[PDB]
Amino acid sequence: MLTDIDGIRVGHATDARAMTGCTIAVFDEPVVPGVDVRGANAATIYTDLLYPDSVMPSVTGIMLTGGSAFGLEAALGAVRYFEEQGRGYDVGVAKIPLVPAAVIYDLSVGDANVRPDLAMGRRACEAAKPGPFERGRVGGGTGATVGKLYGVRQSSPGGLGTATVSLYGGIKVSAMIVVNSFGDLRDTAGRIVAGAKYEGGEFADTYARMKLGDKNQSALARMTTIGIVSTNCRLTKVEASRMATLAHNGLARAICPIHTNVDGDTIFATGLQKSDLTAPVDLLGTAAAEAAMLACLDAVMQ
Amino acid sequence: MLTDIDGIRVGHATDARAMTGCTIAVFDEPVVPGVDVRGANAATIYTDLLYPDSVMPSVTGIMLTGGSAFGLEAALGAVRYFEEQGRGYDVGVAKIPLVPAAVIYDLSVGDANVRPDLAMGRRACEAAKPGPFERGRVGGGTGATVGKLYGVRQSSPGGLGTATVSLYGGIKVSAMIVVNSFGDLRDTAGRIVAGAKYEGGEFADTYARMKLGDKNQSALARMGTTIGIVSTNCRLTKVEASRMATLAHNGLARAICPIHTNVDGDTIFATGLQKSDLTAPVDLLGTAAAEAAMLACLDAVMQ
Ligand code: NA
Ligand code: NA
Numbered sequence: 236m237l238t239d240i241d242g243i244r245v246g247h248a249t250d251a252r253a254m255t256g257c258t259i260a261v262f263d264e265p266v267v268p269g270v271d272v273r274g275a276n277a278a279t280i281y282t283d284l285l286y287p288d289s290v291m292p293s294v295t296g297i298m299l300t301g302g303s304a305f306g307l308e309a310a311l312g313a314v315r316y317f318e319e320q321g322r323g324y325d326v327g328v329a330k331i332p333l334v335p336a337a338v339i340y341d342l343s344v345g346d347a348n349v350r351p352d353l354a355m356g357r358r359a360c361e362a363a364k365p366g367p368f369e370r371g372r373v374g375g376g377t378g379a380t381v382g383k384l385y386g387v388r389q390s391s392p393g394g395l396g397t398a399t400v401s402l403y404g405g406i407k408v409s410a411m412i413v414v415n416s417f418g419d420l421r422d423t424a425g426r427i428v429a430g431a432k433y434e435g436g437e438f439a440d441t442y443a444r445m446k447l448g449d450k451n452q453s454a455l456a457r458m459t460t461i462g463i464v465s466t467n468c469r470l471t472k473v474e475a476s477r478m479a480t481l482a483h484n485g486l487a488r489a490i491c492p493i494h495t496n497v498d499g500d501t502i503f504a505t506g507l508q509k510s511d512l513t514a515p516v517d518l519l520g521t522a523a524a525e526a527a528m529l530a531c532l533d534a535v536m537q
Numbered sequence: 538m539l540t541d542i543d544g545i546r547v548g549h550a551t552d553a554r555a556m557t558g559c560t561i562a563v564f565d566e567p568v569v570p571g572v573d574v575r576g577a578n579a580a581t582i583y584t585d586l587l588y589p590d591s592v593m594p595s596v597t598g599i600m601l602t603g604g605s606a607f608g609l610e611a612a613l614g615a616v617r618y619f620e621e622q623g624r625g626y627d628v629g630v631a632k633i634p635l636v637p638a639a640v641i642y643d644l645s646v647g648d649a650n651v652r653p654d655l656a657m658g659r660r661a662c663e664a665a666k667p668g669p670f671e672r673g674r675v676g677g678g679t680g681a682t683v684g685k686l687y688g689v690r691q692s693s694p695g696g697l698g699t700a701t702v703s704l705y706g707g708i709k710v711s712a713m714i715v716v717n718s719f720g721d722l723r724d725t726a727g728r729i730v731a732g733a734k735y736e737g738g739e740f741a742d743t744y745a746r747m748k749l750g751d752k753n754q755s756a757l758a759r760m761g762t763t764i765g766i767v768s769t770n771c772r773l774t775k776v777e778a779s780r781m782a783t784l785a786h787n788g789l790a791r792a793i794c795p796i797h798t799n800v801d802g803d804t805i806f807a808t809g810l811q812k813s814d815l816t817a818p819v820d821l822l823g824t825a826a827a828e829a830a831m832l833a834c835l836d837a838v839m840q
Contacts, residue, residue, distance in 0.1 A: 278585070279584075
């Protein structure tokens with residue numbers, strides 16, 4: 236539950252008929268951000284200020300949205316909302332809020348022509364609250380599918396999931412993940428729980444089929460899992476980027492194949508600018524991986 | 538003149554009252570793209586698909602916009618236009634266009650509250666045409682300023698410039714650049730042509746003043762831009778397009794000082810053609826792109 240971390244609120248905007256939506260994490264306490272875009276097919280906005288050799292931005296929130304490339308419009312909707320509320324870096328003549336965002340492709344279920352837009356991004360910020368939030372096919376996970384080797388008709392439902400890992404000394408690492416993976420999702424035993432299905436109804440085992448020579452028939456094939464991991468420790472920008480990089484290891488333990496040519500897999504990481512809690516980044520990063528992994532499964536047990 | 542390259546059209550949208558705008562380069566022939574974000578303060582969209590280890594996107598156009606972070610909304614305006622015209626990667630249920638973009642900060646001149654938005658991005662696309670285009674304080678360069686050590690009040694005007702370098706065999710490399718640089722711009726001699734000014738109008742020499750201890754008083758200085766497109770009519774791979782973008786920054790370094798600072802969002806996009814008979818070593822193309830970018834920086838402030 237991402238809101239276990241100080242100052243985070245989460246809001247969803249959900250169109251259950253068109254099967255799309257977006258989710259925003261809002262930071263009421265200032266954060267230190269990092270990112271790792273590992274997939275080969277990612278569409279993002281504002282990620283350049285999240286790298287260690289950039290200046291320290293003032294991140295107001297981070298968005299996970301449907302709509303493929305079109306859905307980054309909802310991030311501008313969020314930016315507009317926040318400017319109206321008086322948030323963002325103060326340059327005197329204005330305040331400049333920043334809402335980095337990544338997308339999933341969800342156009343092949345429900346309505347292809349409805350995507351998160353300026354109004355829907357604003358709706359998600361209006362809805363943002365503390366405490367527990369809904370999981371499953373909601374917000375950015377509303378049109379998420381898993382296992383697309385034979386196209387979306389043989390896929391399983393994906394969704395939005397969350398988990399919190401507790402370490403010593405009051406330290407927490409939480410994740411919120413939207414699973415729309417090309418590959419199959421397995422539990423900690425190694426059982427397929429969501430994935431491409433044969434016509435006859437059983438899980439096909441995407442990786443086993445591809446080794447035999449079955450060809451990727453997904454819509455993007457001719458040329459995603461996205462999330463946020465957050466901790467109540469203090470980080471530097473370098474550590475936040477290292478944390479985001481290690482979190483991908485969690486994804487690799489749950490999803491196979493991962494980081495393919497149709498996947499836009501992206502992890503955002505945050506720590507708090509003011510906090511007395513510190514810990515080695517290699518441990519935080521390992522916990523981030525575990526939380527990310529657990530969140531992937533949470534997504535499909537709703 | 539960026540439109541000297543096969544298949545490129547350029548359109549501006551200009552708000553001369555608010556002092557902001559955007560410029561789009563539209564690709565009627567399929568391109569191979571690359572990018573190098575070198576500044577420490579860049580705001581961009583869609584750049585991940587432009588790296589060598591990403592899949593080959595279908596880039597419909599690239600936009601240079603004002604408006605700081607808010608201006609990337611014009612890029613989504615362009616995306617909507619192109620979808621309606623039937624351009625973009627065909628996914629069966631839809632076509633998905635892509636319009637990578639980078640911004641300058643122009644909110645400290647004219648009106649801070651007007652920025653390129655969905656409609657302004659659409660206006661630039663509608664206006665996109667072949668042949669010669671206007672330069673100076675137009676389009677993405679409308680609210681551009683140069684030399685902000687002492688704030689925008691003592692700066693010089695920036696703008697949007699372009700240049701073509703001809704090599705052997707019909708090979709061309711062209712550049713289009715929006716100069717909004719923190720630093721001063723110098724000619725090949727090392728004379729200052731645009732830069733931070735003392736109150737009475739003489740050039741202060743930004744770098745000389747900083748070495749003596751004058752402190753950055755620009756709006757963005759408390760957190761601790763030149764943007765452009767270089768294009769060639771040669772066929773490139775994705776690796777070569779990114780190498781071209783990386784080398785092109787060298788041209789910026791020859792013209793602008795300081796460059797790549799903590800208040801600069803310096804970003805160069807590079808394109809080559811997917812279909813062309815023309816090839817050449819990327820290190821030579823890269824050097825010509827540097828020269829083109831340098832000449833375009835100067836064009837921006839003489840027009
Ligand atoms: Na949909
Ligand atoms: Na302005």
